[PDB]
Design a protein around this ligand. Structure first.
Ligand SMILES: O=C1CC[C@H](NC(=O)c2ccccc2C(=O)O)C(=O)N1
Ligand SMILES: [Zn+2]
Length: 107
């Protein structure tokens, strides 16, 4: 039972442990926004249940080569992280904020 990652606010299924993706040799990145707020971000190859908000941006990306878009939970609107695109190996992935996910057993 790969564990399941749900939205912490509502419980919607978002991703799974077996979809964790090492970027830079690690699937966990401790990063901060340009205001100096820390986020602990886990990278996933795939995710479901998310809505993308806005257009992609290249500014301030944590991951070289990728442009990003805000990702919210499609059920409750919680800001769960970001979708990345435009790169290679992989072309796209998700960076999700660990503390906004709740990891647990399958249904
Ligand atoms: O790779 C990326 C994804 C997006 C991310 N930006 C933010 O985290 C951001 C920017 C301005 C204000 C707040 C935030 C935030 O979501 O915490 C950033 O700095 N890098
Ligand atoms: Zn939610």
């Amino acid at each position: 039972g790969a564990s399941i990652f749900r939205c912490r606010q509502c419980g919607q299924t978002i991703s799974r442990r077996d979809w964790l993706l090492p970027m830079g040799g690690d699937h966990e990145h401790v990063v901060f926004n340009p205001h100096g707020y820390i986020h602990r971000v886990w990278c996933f190859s795939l995710a479901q249940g998310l809505n993308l908000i806005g257009r992609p941006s290249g500014e301030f990306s944590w991951f070289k080569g990728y442009d990003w878009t805000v990702a919210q939970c499609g059920q409750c609107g919680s800001h769960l992280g970001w979708h990345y695109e435009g790169g290679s190996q992989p072309q796209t992935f998700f960076g999700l904020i660990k503390d906004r996910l709740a990891e647990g057993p399958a249904d």
